[PDB]
Amino acid sequence: VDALPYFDQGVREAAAALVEEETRRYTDIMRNEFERLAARQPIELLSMKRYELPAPSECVNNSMAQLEHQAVRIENLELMSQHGCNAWKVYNENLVHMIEHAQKELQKLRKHIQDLNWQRKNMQLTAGSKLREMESNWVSLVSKNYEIERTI
Amino acid sequence: SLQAPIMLLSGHEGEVYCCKFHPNGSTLASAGFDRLILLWNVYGDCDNYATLKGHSGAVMELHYNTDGSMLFSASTDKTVAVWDSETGERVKRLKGHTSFVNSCYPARRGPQLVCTGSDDGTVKLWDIRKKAAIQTFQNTYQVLAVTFNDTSDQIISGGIDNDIKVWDLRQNKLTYTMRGHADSVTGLSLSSEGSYLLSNAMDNTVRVWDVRPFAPKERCVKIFQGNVHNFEKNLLRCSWSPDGSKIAAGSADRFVYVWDTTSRRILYKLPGHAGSINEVAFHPDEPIIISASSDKRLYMGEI
Amino acid sequence: LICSISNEVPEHPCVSPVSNHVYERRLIEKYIAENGTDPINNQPLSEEQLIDIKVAHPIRPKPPSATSIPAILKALQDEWDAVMLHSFTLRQQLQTTRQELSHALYQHDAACRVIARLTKEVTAAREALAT
Amino acid sequence: ELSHALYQHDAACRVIARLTKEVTAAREALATL
Amino acid sequence: EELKKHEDSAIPRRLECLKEDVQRQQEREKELQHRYADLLLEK
Numbered sequence: 001v002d003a004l005p006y007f008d009q010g011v012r013e014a015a016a017a018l019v020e021e022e023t024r025r026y027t028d029i030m031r032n033e034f035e036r037l038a039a040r041q042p043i044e045l046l047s048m049k050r051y052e053l054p055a056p057s058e059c060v061n062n063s064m065a066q067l068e069h070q071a072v073r074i075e076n077l078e079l080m081s082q083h084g085c086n087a088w089k090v091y092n093e094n095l096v097h098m099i100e101h102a103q104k105e106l107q108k109l110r111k112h113i114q115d116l117n118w119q120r121k122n123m124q125l126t127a128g129s130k131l132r133e134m135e136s137n138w139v140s141l142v143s144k145n146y147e148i149e150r151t152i
Numbered sequence: 153s154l155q156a157p158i159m160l161l162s163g164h165e166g167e168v169y170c171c172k173f174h175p176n177g178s179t180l181a182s183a184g185f186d187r188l189i190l191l192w193n194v195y196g197d198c199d200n201y202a203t204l205k206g207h208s209g210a211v212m213e214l215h216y217n218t219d220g221s222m223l224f225s226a227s228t229d230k231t232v233a234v235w236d237s238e239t240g241e242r243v244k245r246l247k248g249h250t251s252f253v254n255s256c257y258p259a260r261r262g263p264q265l266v267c268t269g270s271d272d273g274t275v276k277l278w279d280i281r282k283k284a285a286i287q288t289f290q291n292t293y294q295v296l297a298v299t300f301n302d303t304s305d306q307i308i309s310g311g312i313d314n315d316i317k318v319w320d321l322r323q324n325k326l327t328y329t330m331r332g333h334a335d336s337v338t339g340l341s342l343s344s345e346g347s348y349l350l351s352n353a354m355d356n357t358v359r360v361w362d363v364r365p366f367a368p369k370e371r372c373v374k375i376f377q378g379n380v381h382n383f384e385k386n387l388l389r390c391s392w393s394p395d396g397s398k399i400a401a402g403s404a405d406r407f408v409y410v411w412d413t414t415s416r417r418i419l420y421k422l423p424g425h426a427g428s429i430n431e432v433a434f435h436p437d438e439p440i441i442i443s444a445s446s447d448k449r450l451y452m453g454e455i
Numbered sequence: 456l457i458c459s460i461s462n463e464v465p466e467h468p469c470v471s472p473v474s475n476h477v478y479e480r481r482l483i484e485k486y487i488a489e490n491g492t493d494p495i496n497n498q499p500l501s502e503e504q505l506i507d508i509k510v511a512h513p514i515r516p517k518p519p520s521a522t523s524i525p526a527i528l529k530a531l532q533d534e535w536d537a538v539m540l541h542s543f544t545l546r547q548q549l550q551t552t553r554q555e556l557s558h559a560l561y562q563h564d565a566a567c568r569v570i571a572r573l574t575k576e577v578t579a580a581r582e583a584l585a586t
Numbered sequence: 587e588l589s590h591a592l593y594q595h596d597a598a599c600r601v602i603a604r605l606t607k608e609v610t611a612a613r614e615a616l617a618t619l
Numbered sequence: 620e621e622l623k624k625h626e627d628s629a630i631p632r633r634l635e636c637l638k639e640d641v642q643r644q645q646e647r648e649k650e651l652q653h654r655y656a657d658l659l660l661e662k
Contacts, residue, residue, distance in 0.1 A: 015599025022565020039543030091514025148651025365655030580612030
């Protein structure tokens with residue numbers, strides 16, 4: 001389990017293969033039905049392709065529908081310019097308050113994680129020294145035990 | 153930790169040559185030119201409870217046993233005093249030297265033995281029950297520092313002949329000579345394992361010597377510089393940390409020297425002494441230091 | 456500023472008092488009726504427990520080419536396309552994640568056995584040099 | 587779970603790289619002795 | 620967070636193993652001297 005990242009400054013592709021070899025050894029209504037069918041088939045349901053084309057010389061209705069539509073647009077368009085003009089930039093200000101809040105959280109997350117990493121790093125250098133101390137003492141016995149036996 | 157770090161201790165009246173921490177680490181003995189032995193607390197408020205007289209000289213070297221029972225004092229009136237750690241009585245006074253006793257050391261874990269060295273050229277062995285010297289080694293010159301190994305089989309002795317000499321008790325011959333100091337050796341200390349021995353000398357080089365059955369035959373292991381010796385010609389003492397990790401040495405430029413034993417790097421250069429320093433010592437449990445100097449005062453550094 | 460369910464910019468945001476997180480009212484109201492608990496923390500939560508937060512009618516201006524015609528035909532069509540193809544693609548993202556996790560764990564185990572096998576190997580080889 | 591595994595996998599992988607080179611050092615040492 | 624916990628685990632146990640590994644090495648050092656020391660007794 002233990003593998004020191006900060007301390008071990010001196011193989012990933014090799015060890016990945018050895019770990020790989022041990023792995024070789026071991027709620028909606030009707031809405032969901034038509035939505036999943038539309039995505040699976042890759043086909044969007046056709047809309048009213050009628051209003052744009054039409055033809056001069058049933059059309060008494062189509063004419064009267066056009067008139068009303070235009071009126072609505074124009075009244076609506078007029079409100080929208082003035083309404084749009086009033087709001088054309090009032091909503092843009094809201095989007096800047098929404099954006100800056102996300103990047104403040106990017107910083108708050110950035111600061112915690114950095115601290116954690118630093119902690120880990122510091123922690124390592126502690127033990128890597130202790131392991132260095134152990135190995136020096138290991139090599140001392142190794143030759144000490146020999147030099148005792150050589151003389152006996 | 154105890155109290156607040158510093159805990160300066162006064163009460164002494166002349167120079168303070170020596171100081172030792174109790175084997176449990178709860179009391180302290182200090183001594184020097186005052187012809188007095190003071191027993192003080194290490195905890196609480198560090199206040200005097202016992203004053204121990206019984207000398208007509210300067211109390212050069214101070215030591216303990218490993219139990220914290222028997223207090224051994226080497227004085228400058230050719231005698232050594234043996235006391236009990238509590239109750240304060242003169243238990244055994246031993247007089248064999250014809251000149252000034254520079255240092256004493258008790259052989260630990262063995263039968264009770266004390267080895268002393270004096271200015272007449274003699275290194276003498278002492279059994280506490282016999283009222284007589286056991287073995288006497290005329291070197292030829294003045295001997296300043298004397299200690300045992302752990303096996304109670306050798307005498308490791310430093311003199312003014314620039315050469316550490318190791319005597320075997322069974323052969324009664326000059327076994328080892330250690331060359332490498334250019335001036336007189338003033339203080340020796342054997343480690344808690346017995347592997348290494350620390351030496352001060354007047355050439356201002358602190359040396360570590362490995363005392364082992366099997367030797368590299370040139371035992372110049374570690375060399376420390378920075379330690380200052382001067383015209384005062386004091387007997388400068390050195391000490392090991394309990395885990396052998398830190399090294400203290402007294403200095404004559406009023407700086408408390410503590411090295412790291414593995415990197416040979418000066419850990420601590422604590423100031424706060426007006427006079428030159430005689431002995432720096434480590435508490436046996438915790439990193440607390442008693443430092444003793446010629447400014448009549450003691451300091452408790454808490455690391 | 457956003458909703459913590461759909462990924463919207465809410466028109467009537469409401470905050471829950473068990474876990475401080477802003478949801479759009481319709482979407483949080485639907486979750487409580489499905490299963491009466493907070494979606495994120497899985498804590499007990501009801502419709503009365505919610506607290507509406509003033510939004511003062513969130514800015515959504517009506518485009519210049521706004522009529523009954525595009526709003527009925529083109530705009531409403533795009534909205535139910537965008538709902539359909541996103542949740543289908545989001546359902547595709549769940550399973551993938553699950554599979555990934557499973558295989559990751561699988562691979563991970565195999566390496567643990569190598570380390571355990573090599574931990575007995577190395578120290579005994581070092582021990583043999585000591586002997 | 588994917589992220590914690592992949593990190594800990596390549597972390598546990600470095601245990602082997604270290605272990606293999608020490609095991610190897612024990613062989614030539616003992617062999618030559 | 621979890622990675623940090625993993626690192627913590629990684630530390631406690633690596634050292635203690637090497638610590639006990641060092642203790643045993645010291646024993647072989649501690650005895651081998653004595654046989655050398657007993658060479659002087661026969662002399």
